[PDB]
From a paper:
The assembly is propagated in one direction by alternating SlpA_I dimers and SlpA_II dimers and in the other by the pore spanning N terminus of SlpA_I. The self-assembly region (SA) is formed by domains SlpA_I and SlpA_II, building a 2D crystalline network that forms the exposed surface of the SlpA layer.
We determined the atomic resolution structures of all functional domains (I-III from N- to C-termini) present in the three S-layer proteins SlpA_ac, SlpX_ac, and SlpA_amy. The Lactobacillus S-layers are anchored to the cell wall through interaction with teichoic acids (TA), either lipoteichoic acid (LTA) or wall teichoic acid (WTA).
Numbering used by the authors: 30 to 40, 48 to 66, 69 to 197
The structure:
C-alpha cells in the first residue's frame, strides 16, 4: 500500500471507449470469380485497460445492409463502391468481478458507430452515440447491438 516509486504516467461524455474494427472484402466476377468476406472485432478501453467484446454466436452474430436498404446482404456478395451498415448483435464486455455492479458509459468518437441496449435506468435506447449501463454481478456489460455505418468493401489485395 506504500507509494515510493517515481511514476509520471498520466491516467468526456463517456468512460468506456468502444472501437469496432470491420474488414469487408468485395467479390470479384471472372480467373475463377471470388466470393466476398467480412470479419472484425469490437474492443473497448476502461480505466486504462483494453477488453475484447464477446459475441453470443461464433456465426451469424451480425447482419449487413446497404445504406438506405433493409435487405440482408450475404458477405459472399459484398461489392466495392457500396456504403454498408454492419449490425453486431448480443455484444458483451467482461470488465471482471472487481467492476461488478458499477455504472459505466459506453461511447465512440466515430459518428458512424451507434449502440442499442438497456441503460442503467432500465430504459431501451436505440441507435444512440453513448449508453450508460449497469454492470451485472460478474462485471459484465450487455448490448443488444453495435452498428457501424459507411463500411466499404475493399478490392482484394490477393493479386
Ligand atoms: Cl473507432
Ligand atoms: Cl473511440
Ligand atoms: Hg470509436
Amino acid at each position: 500500500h506504500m507509494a515510493t516509486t517515481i511514476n509520471a504516467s498520466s491516467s468526456a461524455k463517456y468512460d468506456v471507449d468502444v472501437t469496432p474494427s470491420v474488414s469487408a472484402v468485395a467479390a470479384n466476377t471472372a480467373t475463377p470469380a471470388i466470393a466476398g468476406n467480412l470479419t472484425g472485432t469490437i474492443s473497448a478501453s476502461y480505466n486504462g485497460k483494453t477488453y475484447t467484446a464477446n459475441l453470443k454466436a461464433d456465426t451469424e452474430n451480425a447482419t449487413i445492409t446497404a445504406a438506405g436498404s433493409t435487405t440482408a446482404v450475404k458477405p459472399a456478395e459484398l461489392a466495392a463502391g457500396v456504403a454498408y451498415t454492419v449490425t453486431v448483435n448480443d455484444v458483451s464486455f467482461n470488465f471482471g468481478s472487481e467492476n461488478a455492479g458499477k455504472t459505466v458509459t459506453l461511447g465512440c468518437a466515430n459518428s458512424n458507430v451507434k449502440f442499442t441496449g438497456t441503460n442503467s435506468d432500465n430504459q431501451t435506447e436505440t441507435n444512440v452515440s453513448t449508453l450508460k449501463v449497469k454492470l451485472d454481478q460478474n462485471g459484465v456489460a450487455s448490448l443488444t447491438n453495435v452498428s457501424i455505418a459507411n463500411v466499404y468493401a475493399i478490392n482484394t489485395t490477393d493479386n
